[PDB]
Amino acid sequence: AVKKIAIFGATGQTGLTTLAQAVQAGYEVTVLVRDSSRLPSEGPRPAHVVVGDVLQAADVDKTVAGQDAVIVLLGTRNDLSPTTVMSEGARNIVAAMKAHGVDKVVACTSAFLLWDPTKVPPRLQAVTDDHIRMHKVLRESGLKYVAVMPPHIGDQPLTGAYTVTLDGRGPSRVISKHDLGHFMLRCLTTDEYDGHSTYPSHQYQ
């Protein structure tokens, strides 16, 4: 079973709760962070912290070495500009996984990669184009890859009661950040989603 994981994007909205949940669940967690002040003092703490950048192959290599699986929650925070950060990061992650024998990656893009592709809001098209590039990198890697394609990420509580479909239709167009992290972790203990795209959603009201 998976025991050691690396999380990329651990200081982001979804990353922080995925990190806390992973530690609480008993995983030995390594994170790559550019700025360690963005990790919390309170609550569960990662076992290992690598300071560095996902665009630097050597930093990624140090983070992936010795792991059983990788969770990818990279993103651009509020920046909607044209970008290759996520896809170039994914290229480095795949290379490091292959160099170190790691064969399982669970990575977040977005439900826009399941929905009608002519229906992406213009302001999100540039980020979506890089999610598509990252999905291609991961699909073509040959590694066991679970593509997680969430709708709007909300602040609702953790429930563990969301629905996962394979086609982008479901009970709602929202998933709480906590539930999304819980799902990422679920993907570490089953092979049922390997090679598939997944759509987690739930009605919180």
Ligand X SMILES: NC(=O)c1ccc[n+]([C@@H]2O[C@H](COP(=O)([O-])OP(=O)(O)OC[C@H]3O[C@@H](n4cnc5c(N)ncnc54)[C@H](OP(=O)(O)O)[C@@H]3O)[C@@H](O)[C@H]2O)c1
Ligand Y SMILES: O=C(O)c1c(Cl)c(Cl)c(Cl)c(Cl)c1-c1c2cc(Br)c(=O)c(Br)c-2oc2c(Br)c([O-])c(Br)cc12
The annotated binding site for NADP(+) is made up of: 9, 11-14, 34, 37-38, 53-54, 74-75, 77, 86, 108, 131, 152-153
3-state secondary structure of 16: helix
Subset of 142-171 contacting ligand X (CB under 6 A): 150, 152-153
Q: Report the sign of the C-alpha dihedral through residues 153, 196, 93, 96, in that order.
A: positive
Q: Report how far residue 91's alpha carbon sits from residue 159's, in angstroms, rounded to the nearest whole number.
A: 33
Percent helix, strand, coil in the chain, to 5, is 40, 20, 40
Subset of 49-68 contacting ligand X (CB under 6 A): 53-55
Residue 71 touching ligand X (CB under 6 A): no
Catalytic residue among 33, 106, 108, 138: 108
Instruction: Look up residue 145 and give its DSSP letter.
Output: E
Binding partner of residue 45 among ligand X, ligand Y, none, CB under 5 to 8 Å per kind? none
Binding partner of residue 124 among ligand Y, ligand X, none, CB under 5 to 8 Å per kind? ligand Y
Contact pick of 5, 6, 12, 19 for ligand X (by CB under 6 A): 12
Q: Are strands 197-201 and 163-165 parallel, antiparallel or unpaired?
A: antiparallel
Structure tokens belonging to residue 31: 């994170």
Could you confirm whether 108 is annotated as catalytic? Answer: yes
Bridge partners, 136 (sequence order): none
Contact pick of 127, 147, 187, 188 for ligand Y (by CB under 6 A): 127
Identify which of residues 150 and 168 has a Cβ nearer to ligand X in the complex. Answer: 150
Residue 152 touching ligand Y (CB under 6 A): yes
Per-position b or e across 102-129, b if 16+ CB within 10 A of its CB: bbbbbbbbbbbbbbeeeebeeeeebbbe
Residue 139 touching ligand X (CB under 6 A): no
Q: For 25, list phi and psi in degrees, rounded to 5.
A: -75, -10
Instruction: Look up residue 134 and give its DSSP letter.
Output: H
Give catalytic residue positions: 108, 187
- Rule CB under 6 A: which residues touch ligand Y? 110-112, 121, 124, 127, 151-152, 173
Binding site for ligand X (CB under 6 A): 9-15, 32-35, 38, 53-55, 73-77, 85, 108, 110, 127, 150, 152-153
